[PDB]
Amino acid sequence: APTLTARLYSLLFRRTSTFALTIAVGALFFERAFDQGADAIYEHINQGKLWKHIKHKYEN
Amino acid sequence: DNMSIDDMMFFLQGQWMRLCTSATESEVVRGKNILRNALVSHLDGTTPVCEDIGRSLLTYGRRIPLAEWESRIAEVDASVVREVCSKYFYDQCPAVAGLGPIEQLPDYNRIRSGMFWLRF
Amino acid sequence: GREFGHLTRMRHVITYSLSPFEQRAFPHYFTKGIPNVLRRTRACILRVAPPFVVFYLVYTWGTQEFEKSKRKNPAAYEN
Amino acid sequence: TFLRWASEPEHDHRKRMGLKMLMMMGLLLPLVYAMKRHKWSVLKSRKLAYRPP
Amino acid sequence: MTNIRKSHPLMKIINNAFIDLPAPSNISSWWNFGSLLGICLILQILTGLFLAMHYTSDTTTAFSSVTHICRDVNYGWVIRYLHANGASMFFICLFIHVGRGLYYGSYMFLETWNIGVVLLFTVMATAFMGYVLPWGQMSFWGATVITNLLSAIPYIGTDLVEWIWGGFSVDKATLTRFFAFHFILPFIITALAAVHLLFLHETGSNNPTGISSDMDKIPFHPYYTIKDILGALFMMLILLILVLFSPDLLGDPDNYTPANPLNTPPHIKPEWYFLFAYAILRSIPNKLGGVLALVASILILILMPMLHTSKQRSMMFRPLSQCLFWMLVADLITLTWIGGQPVEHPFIIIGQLASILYFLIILVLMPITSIIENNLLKW
Amino acid sequence: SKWLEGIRKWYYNAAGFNKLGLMRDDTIYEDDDVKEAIRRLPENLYNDRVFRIKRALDLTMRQQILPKEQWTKYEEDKFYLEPYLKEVIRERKEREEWAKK
Amino acid sequence: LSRFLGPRYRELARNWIPTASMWGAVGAVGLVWATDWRLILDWVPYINGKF
């Protein structure tokens, strides 16, 4: 009964080509996810100050 | 020689990886023929034949007949060789023993790195 | 010139090593590492700290003395 | 506050980039350290024995 | 067949340099500061190249160009503060490397040490000329004072100063010259660093214990490569902390005012890396004496190999020498602090005593102490 | 003498080459005279010196010190290289003196 | 300095002093010529015409 990690190795990490493709796709998705999450964190920490948080009052 | 260890290790690991990744039919036929000749030539004379009988009974539980060996050899193809070599030789940690002027022998990290190809 | 083959002559020195994949990256990292760090700090501190302690004393003395120098002297305006 | 914005108009963007770099470093530094340890474990666990004749 | 890494000429050089280079197994994290310096140099070159795409060397447009980079070039502030704080990190790594060389006896590699001293001089010149480029008040007046120091040279000082100035005082000509020199010098620094690494590879690398490590050499590619990458990551962490949280921590606020040649700033102090030399200069009352002392401060590294008297290369096994070395480091911090502080009653005497102690520690106390240690070891 | 021996022993313990298993001559700087002296050493002493140095470099690699029972004692430290180094320096002094006149 | 204090080196200094003095003159003339040092050049008769 292979574990998750062994499964990951035998599926994607064994040959460098699949490794690199995994790295690229993970890179794209991680970039998206980290950007979203960090932006959420920064906005929450600075909630009420950012122009995006107050533009509605002065817009329209 | 003391100054040729690194080169020979590089070539040996290169051959291992070449068999693992891009073995060809012709060399497979050569290997099968060599194996057939070794099997038939070794089992010549009462002493080697008796040795094979005893060792085969102890290990295989049966003396595999030469015809069975020939059939199993004939089943071998380039795909089979690549599969088995990838299973046993590729990205596997090796065991190394050195004796004498072995300073040029690559450090174990380099030896393990040689066991896989970044191209493949 | 300096290549692995002919660096030096050594005899009868046997070295046993383990594959990275067979051994843990962080073995006893805190159970052994923290005592070792404490030992290293103990060995070094007597030699290292005192010069910086003297520097801190000098710095505090200089800052305080400058602040006193800028301060007014009552005797100058006694008359 | 307006004068501070004038002097440093990239202030909020600088803070955002600083947060992102802090998180990315907090991720990477342990991982690169782990890679270094994995490569160095062969030497760290190396046992040398002198066996003179 | 042959391995291309070992047979192709460019690949052969690269291999012998940073792939199969026999490196000692026990070099500490103090041996990553050299690679950190190389990374800093490459980073400074790239960042300065991107800055120069928007920098103009005319006095009418210098400060306006810097403001244009800061506010209008996309991500211009990142590049600019990366350069400014990377210079400080550069000098941090330079000082740490010099300290490592003193402590572990790396100065015994005469050729590498002397090339390193030349690199130090060139890097300090590059930093000074670069600081003039923003053309703030600090740039102008610090340039005036530092260049005016050269006038103390007898019989040729005035002519040499006016030649460097390009005129009667610091002005547009000087700014343009400093831009050209600050551009060209880093590449000379790279060439000198290549010669530096060549001389180093000729004799190998000294280990912390100070004993020859030919028995225990390990390849550079599978170990120190990842170790240096890690050091680069840590250095980048520190640098990005500076860039993205305290971008003006190490810079004087006055440099954000346009240079006024008719009014001086309240305080005229050079950058922090030059502060110890500035304090030494101020210590000596005579101008020529001050200039000579400032030169000797750096040139003493040339005499350091001659001063070596211990039978042991490294200070790891010499406790008293370690006490002297840390006294010297504390003295350097003291000199930097005094050079920061204004010239007044408390600071003057501390600076004079600190400079005297610096020269004494390097010249007299350390060799005598090493001789005493040799006697103690019965050597 | 006892006072001098006491201060020498204090310095010996203050220096860490005993902690790493090295002897005093193991820590000498390898100048040309020292290189010739090492070259002239008998095989047993050369191999022992090489192993002690390698073990010390290994210990410093992991920032560890040898167990206190294995520390080299001040009394048992033997200056193996010193006779050979003295002979080499004597030969060098003779050559320099001949060169002088 | 200890090695280079003997009869032979004192002879060797005497042999190379005329050469060292000659090269020093070459440096002295070259510096004056390159810099057009008017202090020294005024004494020389023909070159004095420059100024």
Ligand code: HEM
């Ligand atoms: C070791 C390499 C270098 C060092 C130590 C160095 C040092 C400095 C320093 C301290 C400043 C002042 C920055 C400020 O006041 O904000 C500066 C500015 C500058 N340097 Fe460099 N520099 C280096 C390389 C270069 C290179 C290679 C170039 C161009 C190819 C360059 C171009 C500039 C420019 C355009 C500025 C103006 C930035 C500003 O106004 O803030 N520098 N340099």
Ligand code: HEM
């Ligand atoms: C931009 C400035 C410099 C660069 C790029 C540079 C580069 C390097 C590099 C890559 C190394 C090998 C790595 C290491 O040993 O840590 C090294 C070592 C060394 N450098 Fe520097 N260096 C610089 C400044 C200096 C200075 C200012 C000095 C002396 C005053 C110096 C003297 C030495 C010495 C003696 C070594 C040998 C260290 C050893 O063998 O352990 N370098 N340098």
